[PDB]
Write a protein that binds this ligand. Structure first.
Ligand SMILES: Cn1ccc(C(=O)NC[C@H]2CCCO2)n1
Length: 185
């Protein structure tokens, strides 16, 4: 792919984070804490899952960023509507305003309804995310495997401003403590 030149500098929005997340001072890394991180509750925070949004809002153009997932067992990544539900249980689907992929139990899947099996020969350590707002496209790339395509959502109906979306996953196993990191441009 030749999307690197649409690179954007993403930072995480503390105010949207689940109350157990720890966001680094530079707002470029997030991990699961072992307890509540001593913040007040607010209507923006994801309550049920270890999720957080980027601060940036996109309503036009082409955007590209990269995320480091090294040594994680579980995570979700992509974009979502600014108006997605924050509280209670929900599925990651385009009907609910999410365009995402994930790792779970040694398999990679795209957040369609129902979910789609991904075919990855080289487990990725870094994921590239490309959004073309006007075209209605969200694509995922395997940076570890020379940028190979993972998945394309096309005919997307964004229906609002988009925000970068992250889920660090639970750490019931003790094997999923590692952070998500936004990689330098
Ligand atoms: C499950 N559910 C429905 C609505 C809410 C909500 O807004 N909670 C946030 C807090 C902290 C201050 C006000 O309430 N949570």
């Amino acid at each position: 792919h030749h999307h690197h030149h649409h690179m954007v500098h993403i930072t995480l929005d503390r105010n949207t984070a689940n109350s157990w997340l720890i966001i680094s001072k530079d707002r470029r890394q997030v991990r699961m804490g072992d307890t509540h991180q001593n913040v007040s509750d607010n209507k923006e925070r994801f309550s049920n899952y270890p999720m957080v949004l980027g601060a940036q809002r996109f309503s036009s153009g082409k955007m590209y960023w990269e995320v480091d997932v090294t040594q994680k067992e579980a995570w979700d990544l992509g974009v979502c509507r600014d108006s997605v539900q924050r509280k209670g249980q929900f599925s990651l689907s385009p009907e609910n305003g999410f365009w995402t992929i994930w790792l779970w139990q040694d398999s990679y899947e795209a957040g369609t309804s129902p979910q789609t099996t991904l075919h990855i020969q080289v487990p990725p350590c870094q994921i590239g995310i490309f959004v073309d707002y006007e075209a209605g496209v969200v694509s995922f790339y395997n940076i570890t495997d020379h940028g190979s395509l993972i998945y394309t959502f096309s005919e997307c109906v964004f229906a609002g401003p988009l925000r970068p979306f992250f889920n660090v996953g639970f750490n019931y196993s003790g094997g999923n403590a590692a952070p998500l990191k936004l990689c330098p441009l």
